[model samples]
Target: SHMTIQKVHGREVLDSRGNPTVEVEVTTEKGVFRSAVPSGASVYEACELRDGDKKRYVGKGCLQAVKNVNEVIGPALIGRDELKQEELDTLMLRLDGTPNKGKLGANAILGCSMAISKAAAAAKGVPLYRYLASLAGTKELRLPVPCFNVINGGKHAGNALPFQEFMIAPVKATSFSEALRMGSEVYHSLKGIIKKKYGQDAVNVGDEGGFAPPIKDINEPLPILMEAIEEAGHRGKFAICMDCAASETYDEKKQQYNLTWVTAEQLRETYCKWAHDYPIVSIEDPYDQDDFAGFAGITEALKGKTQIVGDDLTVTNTERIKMAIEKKACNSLLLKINQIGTISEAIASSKLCMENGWSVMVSHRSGETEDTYIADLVVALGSGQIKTGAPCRGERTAKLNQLLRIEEELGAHAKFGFPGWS
Candidate 1:
């Protein structure tokens, strides 16, 4: 009630991946705040509603979504209370022709929803992180440990690895800034190593900024990353995390994962050995998207040892998250705002996960923007973990840069890492 929405605007923008995406700005008596959306995946509704016109932007343009934002969603918020995020978001959902938010478009609705949150924080004269903390009902604020995806294979590249991402988490860091240094050092060292072993071009990065070397075996990158970390003089203080994105390699015809024809049992055993042999701490999307049994097996096998994170399995939807919890799937949820399509809903999803004693890891899409809203969101929600990408690209580093500033602002109150890292 502090301020009323005065105007709203929408525009089509390009992400780091050169694909068209939606961006929105909400104006108040005080000022205008901006937000942009990302492109990513999952199941269980929340349709994206992109314009399927192949002539424009290679059929990836979000023009229709942006039009809906400006003509339909934006005008509806003209005189509404900027601070009533939940109510405003619900109003948008009501306008949606589909109960699932497919018609009005999540891309359009979320762009507007995120802009209002930023506007509300500005009207209140508080940092976005502090404002979000109050909304999340968190008494303590902690910076999340960064999961740097230093190597990319799997679906991200044409190489042979079954896993999409190989990350390094600095569990022993005293602060978020120090964690960034740890990650950056290892990433640079990794480039040198990969370049040496696989030739200079092999040091090139993928869409998410992780190196894509000429390697086929899934087991190859682990030792390489380990050597990189040790050479960076950060041995025994870091841990590895892998995102298999198992759905990418799933073969529906044979009903099995196609990492050289490894059955679920064999894949599970491979992970078990790697967990004990190296400093591996988390495994995400370790099975097919619908393979609840496979997730349960890994979660049980690695219980009390590492985090079994759900990305493709849960999709940031409460219904799907419940399915996973009831079926005993993953222990952690990879939180991405675009997946659920609303700021309020994303918070609700995190609350649901935390209420059930599960950890949440805020995430970023491979195609991203310079927007730093998530840097503040992760701290505000007290999630304690984030995997933006490797430290090389500017888009990837922007979130980490924002987190570093936040840690500086907190000073004595600044916290790092989560409770469990065994």
Candidate 2:
């Protein structure tokens, strides 16, 4: 057939919130094939239309990211061999690189990956997941391994941590209180070690969130976390990612929930002062999502001090990420899959961000499902950073299931502690 894209047909499989998706049908003289989406009517419907089998892509937000897989990539590869998955993927990436056409890049790559996976499955007469592992021969599909987990606990209001926040290798305590006590003790031990080696100036103030709320008592969170961290001594060992979700500065004009925007100048001052007072290593969504300038300013001001991350700002979408990068917005990304509607696109976005020195943090949404797909992708990609709420919620635990599964499967291949970067 000399490889050709005969025709393309697309029809909506899911349309919600104006994000319409359609199936793609590609025809060739030799045969006709369709791409199947696996997530939902929203994400998977696109796959079903692509001729993908009914299997699911659990972790990594793989479903929402690859919406309308066949529609975007099938026609281009109509007569190509179903077995050349990697070549097809590379070609798809190339097609997406067309200059002056920003909309087609990441989604193009995402859809193409699905198409290639589908072609491989069709050639082998197996499910995509099974087909992916078929070349390795009789293997258990490993999930994404968990590395660093960011806890969304602290203030819950708009303040700081009731206790200092730091990553513990083993988190030695059995009970929450015991954990806190051990963590505090370890915090001090590290501080002494740093002081002895690098001198006292190396010490930085560490705390919970910027402030804790419901009631912003001056005494509770910020002070307590500071005292604990200072007492512990390895201030440089821990960092903070202040989540300003519930912040509201005093307003005299409107007078009711009057804090106009999250990305206000004063708010930046407040956080920046704190950043100076106590060394903060990361700040997530320091400003509101729409505040491009605010975000950019923050990113610029605190370039080396800490990782300025975006959650609400970019909403885990490639377009938003690209715009932010163009504007030099922030140094880090909180990659939440649902925000953009799929796992595959999210993975690709994270990959892209990583390539550009923007660290990727696989994050959990406030509203969550049992899907542990993100966990697998995180491990597979070596993201080394994750955000699950409270260290208590099932949304976080769902991801942990996949992590444990990955460890069980990988055994020797697994690096139990923090997996270092390549």
Candidate 3:
């Protein structure tokens, strides 16, 4: 029985930030399955095609990607077997004939890539997570400890701190439901504290869906987070994670972290001091993508205690992960599906990391949709960690909210914890 794709349609959709993005639908014999691609973090993130016309959507429009999908990849994949995930992906990759998905556009490819899996899952009446788990060849399904991005900074929000996100992971929770409960309460608690200190305007959400207040110093958010957790009455139950996104701040000319002459030595020292002062479980992209040496510096310095995650460094690509692993640059991989431009490649990237004894944390973009695929992805991979965004906006919460239902269906067997990436 060939569960073949009947129709593949592509459309331009607006993301959370009102930027144009790609969306695709695959009509299998099972029914019509759909997926939407998300946009995110600062890059080297595979070439995302834009019209570059500057006439539509201010050149941020993905109409070219959409056209490429509808006129090219979609037509080619029309009669292809939906279950042949890797083969179909390979065929599409060959069609492009270029690295980094620059030919057809990553945005064009990722939408169909995700929708193909949805069709495959529907063809068998299997849960998407379970189906993905089967493809991944693992049964160690676990609900990840949700890292709620409670405070946004850097590129995610225009704040004084030259960091990206400050997330709170409910590390002590025993279930997905428990983790969300803890996270949501703390989010509200933080809201009040922000309102009290920075006024009602300060509690407004950032682009990544976290509250961005005018806290300039690097040390300001730490005690504020403590106060939020203390107010929520969940002290010592959560761990902190920071997304430094340091590449944005990298001063290329001086080879320093910032124009202020923040050297890698002093930056690593700052992280060590912060780790000692707080329950800082993870620090992501403490160095720029090319600074593998700086990554190794922090990895060795924070060896036994904190996780050193490579979001910008790895980009959820195999070559980058291999480079990071061989160099011992970081201990964890931040898996962003769209970053690799296809389901198979993204999974392979994660597989390489896990095979090398590194942990995967499936993440979401700052510009997202109602689609909750990443929630299923995290559980399917059993990565034990996810950071979608703050437990705030619908797009961000959709991922976490979907997981709540998944845990309900999993019943009593779900394991939830912030297990070490090692």
Candidate 4:
């Protein structure tokens, strides 16, 4: 039952700005099918402001990458054994024809990976995650209850950006009850600090560290959140998460983008500081998404302290995650289906992450579609954490709804524990 990519279909989706987006569907001879499309798949925030590197690159940017794959590589993959996942992965990695040293090259792998996984899943006639779990044995792993993220402090000072667009790993524990208690404790600890600094009037401090406040709304800034977590840790609260989406620094001199702009040493220093400051049980994308050297640097330094989670860094791209694994970039992976541009691509990335020692945290995109694709992947794949948003918005709410549904279905076996680190 060797799987080979029979065909690839590409579609253009426009972000809210009407910029083009790229979506792909890979069909194989064995009736295997898979597809990749941007999650939430559009750029509502069109213009590239000072700090908008992430939201600016629409999945359509991969269109150029997709064109290369269809023209050059796609033809070669047909009629090949589709089950050789590793070999297939290798082939995808080798096809680096674009500039930016495969930044464009990533689109092909993303699209191809989706096709391969979907084709494989369909060949086996199993649900996508079922097929993925088969690739990585369904070992009974800890199921972490979701932890909401926020801008607890720093420059965005008074802006209350009430979106859990970023993904995080909760501190995992031996039992579900323990995880929930720790999560609640960490949430309260951060909230308490916000109250202390800004008083009860800080609109950013929602009920229990959410985004519901009375007077003013402060956006979720990373440094302040780290500071608050540090404050909590001093009080002996053990479980807190880091949203690395806010971890990047702005280089006024070089005028580079996010983490791609940070040096390895600077990134290491930040991780050390944040890890030391907060009892940071988990961290996501500590460096800019493109900085491989930086990603590797922090990963090696902080491997055992806690899960160095990847979100914007990996964006669920197999090549990036593949690069991360080769470089020992981090210990855990944050899985966002939309980021990779498809459910099939997301599954492939998740499988690779699980195969490595890395943990999988199924995630929701900031601008989410109603798909609920990642929600299913989280439960079906048995990932450790699930992040949608701060208990609001249809995008976030849709995921929560799915998790509850799965928890109900899992019933007795389901352990509805919060995710955290020791």
Winning candidate number (TM-score) = 1
TM-score of each: 0.97, 0.51, 0.97, 0.57
The TM-score, computed over Cα atoms with residue i paired to residue i, of candidate 2 is 0.51
Candidate 1 segments whose C-alpha is farther than 4 A from its true place = none
- lDDT for model 2, on a 0 to 1 scale? 0.47
Candidate 4 deviant stretches above 4 angstroms:
1-137, 152-238, 246-248, 252-267, 415-422
Tens digits of per-residue lDDT for model 2 on 248-352? 232335322223333267667767887787645667766645667778888879777767778666766677789988888887887754444333455567767
Alpha carbon deviation, residue 264, candidate 2 (Å): 3.3
> What TM-score would candidate 1 get against the native?
0.97
Better of 1 and 3 by TM-score: 1
Q: Write the per-residue lDDT of candidate 1 for residues 254-286, one digit (tens) a residue.
A: 877777587788889888999999878899999
Worst 10 residues of 4 by lDDT: 43-52
Ranking by TM-score: 1, 3, 4, 2
Cα RMSD (Å) per model?
Answer: 1.4, 12.5, 1.6, 8.5
Q: Write the per-residue lDDT of candidate 4 for residues 1-422, one digit (tens) a residue.
A: 34556676655454223444444566765553544333333221111111123554532354565565667667767676666666675665555543222433443455566556657777777755566666656665334457565543222223334222222224444444444444445556656766766677754532122543232432234445555545545334334566645433435355343432454465567568757765566777666566666777777777677677877666566666777888887878877554543344456777777788787777654344443545556766777577665544455556666665555555556655533343
Overall local distance difference test of candidate 3? 0.86
Instruction: Decide which is better by TM-score, 1 or 2.
Output: 1
